[PDB]
PDB file of C-alpha atoms in Angstrom:
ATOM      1  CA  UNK A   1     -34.391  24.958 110.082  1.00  0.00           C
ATOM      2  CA  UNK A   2     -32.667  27.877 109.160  1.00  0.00           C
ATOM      3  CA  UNK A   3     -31.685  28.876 105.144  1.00  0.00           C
ATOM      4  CA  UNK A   4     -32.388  32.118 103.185  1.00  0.00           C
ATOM      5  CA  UNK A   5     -34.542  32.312  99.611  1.00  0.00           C
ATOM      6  CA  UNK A   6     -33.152  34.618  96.736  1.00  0.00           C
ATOM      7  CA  UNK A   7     -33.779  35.016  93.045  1.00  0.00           C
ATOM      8  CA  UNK A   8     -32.349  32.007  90.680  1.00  0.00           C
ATOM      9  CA  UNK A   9     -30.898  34.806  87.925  1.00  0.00           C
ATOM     10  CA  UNK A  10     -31.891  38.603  87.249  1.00  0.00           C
ATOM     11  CA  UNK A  11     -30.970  40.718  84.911  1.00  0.00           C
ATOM     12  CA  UNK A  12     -30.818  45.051  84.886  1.00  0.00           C
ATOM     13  CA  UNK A  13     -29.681  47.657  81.931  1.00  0.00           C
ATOM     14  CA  UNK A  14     -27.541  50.391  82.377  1.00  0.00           C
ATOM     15  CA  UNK A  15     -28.527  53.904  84.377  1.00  0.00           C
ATOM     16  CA  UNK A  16     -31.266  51.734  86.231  1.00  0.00           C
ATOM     17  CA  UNK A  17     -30.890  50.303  89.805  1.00  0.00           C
ATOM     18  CA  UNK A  18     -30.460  47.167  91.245  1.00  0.00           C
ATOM     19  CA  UNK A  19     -32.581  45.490  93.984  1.00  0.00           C
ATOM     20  CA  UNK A  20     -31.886  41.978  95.468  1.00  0.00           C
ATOM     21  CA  UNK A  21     -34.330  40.577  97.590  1.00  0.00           C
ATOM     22  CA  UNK A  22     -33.608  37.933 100.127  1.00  0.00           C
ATOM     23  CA  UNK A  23     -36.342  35.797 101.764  1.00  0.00           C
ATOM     24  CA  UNK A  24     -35.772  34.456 105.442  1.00  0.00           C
ATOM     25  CA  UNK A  25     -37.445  30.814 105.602  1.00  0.00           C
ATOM     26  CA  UNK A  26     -37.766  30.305 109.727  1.00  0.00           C
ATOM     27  CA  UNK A  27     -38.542  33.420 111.496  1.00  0.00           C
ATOM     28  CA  UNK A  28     -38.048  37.133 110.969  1.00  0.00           C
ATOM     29  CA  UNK A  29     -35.082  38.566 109.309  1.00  0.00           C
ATOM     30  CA  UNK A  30     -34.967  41.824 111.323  1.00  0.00           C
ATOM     31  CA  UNK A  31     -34.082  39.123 114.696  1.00  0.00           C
ATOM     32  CA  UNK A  32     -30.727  38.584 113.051  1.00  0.00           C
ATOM     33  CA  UNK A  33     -27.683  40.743 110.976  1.00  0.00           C
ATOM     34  CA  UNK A  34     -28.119  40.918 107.651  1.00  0.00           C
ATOM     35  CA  UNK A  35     -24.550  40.968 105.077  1.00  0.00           C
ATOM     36  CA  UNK A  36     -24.042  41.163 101.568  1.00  0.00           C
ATOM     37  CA  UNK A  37     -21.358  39.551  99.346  1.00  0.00           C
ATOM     38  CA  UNK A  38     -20.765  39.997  95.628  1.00  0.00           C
ATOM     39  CA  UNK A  39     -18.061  36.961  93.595  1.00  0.00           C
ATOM     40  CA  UNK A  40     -16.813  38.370  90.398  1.00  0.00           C
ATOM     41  CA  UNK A  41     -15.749  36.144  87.393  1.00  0.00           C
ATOM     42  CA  UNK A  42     -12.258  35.091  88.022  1.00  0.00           C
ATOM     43  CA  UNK A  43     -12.527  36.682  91.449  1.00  0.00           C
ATOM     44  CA  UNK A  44     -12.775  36.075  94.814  1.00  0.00           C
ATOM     45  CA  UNK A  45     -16.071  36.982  97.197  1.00  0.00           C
ATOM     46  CA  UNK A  46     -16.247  40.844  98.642  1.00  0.00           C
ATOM     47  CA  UNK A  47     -18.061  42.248 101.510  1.00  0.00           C
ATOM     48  CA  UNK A  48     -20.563  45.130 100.363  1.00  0.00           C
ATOM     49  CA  UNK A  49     -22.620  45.811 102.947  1.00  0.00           C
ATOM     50  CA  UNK A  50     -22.370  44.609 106.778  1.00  0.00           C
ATOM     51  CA  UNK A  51     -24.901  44.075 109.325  1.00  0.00           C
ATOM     52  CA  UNK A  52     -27.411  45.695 106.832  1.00  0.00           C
ATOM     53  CA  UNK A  53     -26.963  48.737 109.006  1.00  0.00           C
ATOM     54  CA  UNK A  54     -23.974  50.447 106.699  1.00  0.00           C
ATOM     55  CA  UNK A  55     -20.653  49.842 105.228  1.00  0.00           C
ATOM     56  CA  UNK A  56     -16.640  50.015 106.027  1.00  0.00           C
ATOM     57  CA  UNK A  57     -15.484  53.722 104.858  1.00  0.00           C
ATOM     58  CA  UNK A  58     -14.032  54.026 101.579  1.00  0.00           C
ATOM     59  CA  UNK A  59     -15.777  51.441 100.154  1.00  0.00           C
ATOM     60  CA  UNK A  60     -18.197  52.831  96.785  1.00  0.00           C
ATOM     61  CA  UNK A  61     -21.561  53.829  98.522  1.00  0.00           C
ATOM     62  CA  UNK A  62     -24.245  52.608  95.444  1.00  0.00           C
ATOM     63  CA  UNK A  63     -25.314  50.248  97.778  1.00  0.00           C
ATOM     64  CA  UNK A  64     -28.030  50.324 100.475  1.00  0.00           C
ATOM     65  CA  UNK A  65     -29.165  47.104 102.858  1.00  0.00           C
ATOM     66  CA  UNK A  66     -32.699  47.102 104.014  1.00  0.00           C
ATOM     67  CA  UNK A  67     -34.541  44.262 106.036  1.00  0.00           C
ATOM     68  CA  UNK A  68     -38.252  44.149 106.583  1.00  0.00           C
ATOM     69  CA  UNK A  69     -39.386  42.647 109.305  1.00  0.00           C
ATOM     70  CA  UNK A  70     -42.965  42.773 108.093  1.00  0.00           C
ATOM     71  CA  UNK A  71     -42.674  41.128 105.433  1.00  0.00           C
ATOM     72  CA  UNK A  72     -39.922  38.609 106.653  1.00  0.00           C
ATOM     73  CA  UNK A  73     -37.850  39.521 103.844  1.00  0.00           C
ATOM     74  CA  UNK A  74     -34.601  41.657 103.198  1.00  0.00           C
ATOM     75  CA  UNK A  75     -34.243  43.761 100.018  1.00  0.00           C
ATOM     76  CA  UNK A  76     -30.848  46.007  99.088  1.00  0.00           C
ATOM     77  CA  UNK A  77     -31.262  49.076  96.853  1.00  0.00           C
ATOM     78  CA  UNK A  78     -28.241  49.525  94.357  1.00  0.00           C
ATOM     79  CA  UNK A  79     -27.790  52.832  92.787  1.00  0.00           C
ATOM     80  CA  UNK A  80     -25.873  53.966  89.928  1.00  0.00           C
ATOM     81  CA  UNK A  81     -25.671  50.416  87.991  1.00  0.00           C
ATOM     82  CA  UNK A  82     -22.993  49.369  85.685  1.00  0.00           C
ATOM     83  CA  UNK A  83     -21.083  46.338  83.639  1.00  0.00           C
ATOM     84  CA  UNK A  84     -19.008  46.449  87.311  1.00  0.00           C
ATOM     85  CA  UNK A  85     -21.836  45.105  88.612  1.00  0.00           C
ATOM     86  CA  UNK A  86     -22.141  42.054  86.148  1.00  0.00           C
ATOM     87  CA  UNK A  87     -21.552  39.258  89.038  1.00  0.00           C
ATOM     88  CA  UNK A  88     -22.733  36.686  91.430  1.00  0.00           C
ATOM     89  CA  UNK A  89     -24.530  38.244  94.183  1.00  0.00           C
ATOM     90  CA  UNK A  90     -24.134  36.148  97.959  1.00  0.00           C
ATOM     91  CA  UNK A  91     -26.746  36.754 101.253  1.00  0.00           C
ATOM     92  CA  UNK A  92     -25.548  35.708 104.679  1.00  0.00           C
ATOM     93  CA  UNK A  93     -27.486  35.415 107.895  1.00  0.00           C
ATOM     94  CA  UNK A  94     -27.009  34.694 111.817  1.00  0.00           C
ATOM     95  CA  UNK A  95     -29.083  32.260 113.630  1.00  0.00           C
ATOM     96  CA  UNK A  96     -30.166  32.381 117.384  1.00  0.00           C
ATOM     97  CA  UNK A  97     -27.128  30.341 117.986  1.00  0.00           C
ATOM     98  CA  UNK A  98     -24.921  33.654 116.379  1.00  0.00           C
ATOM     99  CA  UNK A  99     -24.059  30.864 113.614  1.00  0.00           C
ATOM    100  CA  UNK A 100     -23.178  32.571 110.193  1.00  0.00           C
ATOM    101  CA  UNK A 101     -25.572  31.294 107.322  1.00  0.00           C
ATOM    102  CA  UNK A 102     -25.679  31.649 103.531  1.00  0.00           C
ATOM    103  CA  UNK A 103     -28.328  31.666 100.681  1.00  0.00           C
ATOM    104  CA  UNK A 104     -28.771  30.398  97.187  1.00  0.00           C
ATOM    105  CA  UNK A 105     -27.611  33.752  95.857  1.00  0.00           C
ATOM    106  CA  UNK A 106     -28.217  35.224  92.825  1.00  0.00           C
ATOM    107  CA  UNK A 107     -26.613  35.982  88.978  1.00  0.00           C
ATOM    108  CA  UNK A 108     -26.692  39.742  88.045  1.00  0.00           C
ATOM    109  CA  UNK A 109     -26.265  39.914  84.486  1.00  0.00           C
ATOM    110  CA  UNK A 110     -25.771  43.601  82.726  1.00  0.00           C
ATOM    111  CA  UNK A 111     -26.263  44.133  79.421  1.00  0.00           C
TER     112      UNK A 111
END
């Protein structure tokens, strides 16, 4: 079995950062790449970080990927947080057999 564990809604105020944490249930998270997707209202999915490693030039840098092998878990720091941010957060994985996975995902609500 393969399938990731996230938070079922958070919620963060303005001028404070952002942290999603994504929980690997199967083996260790740091085996595999680690991306990040965000789905806006209205909107389609978007790529913010890849590979947990960095992300494609151009593209805001308020984000930061992080996976801990230790603790089995992956956990992005976010800084500079605004209403932009008010979205649907998505986690994707790669199994041993390179097969793309997904998580629950997660609401970010700004207020």
């Amino acid at each position: 079995n393969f399938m990731l564990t996230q938070p079922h809604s958070v919620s963060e105020s303005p001028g404070k950062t952002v942290t999603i944490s994504c929980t690997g249930s199967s083996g260790s998270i740091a085996s595999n790449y680690v991306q990040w997707y965000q789905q806006r209202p209205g909107s389609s999915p978007t790529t913010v970080i890849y590979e947990d490693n960095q992300r494609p030039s151009g593209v805001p840098d308020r984000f930061s990927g992080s996976i801990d092998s230790s603790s089995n878990s992956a956990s992005l720091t976010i800084s500079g947080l605004k209403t932009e941010d008010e979205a649907d957060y998505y986690c994707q994985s790669y199994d041993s057999s390179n097969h793309v996975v997904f998580g629950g995902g997660t609401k970010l609500t700004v207020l």
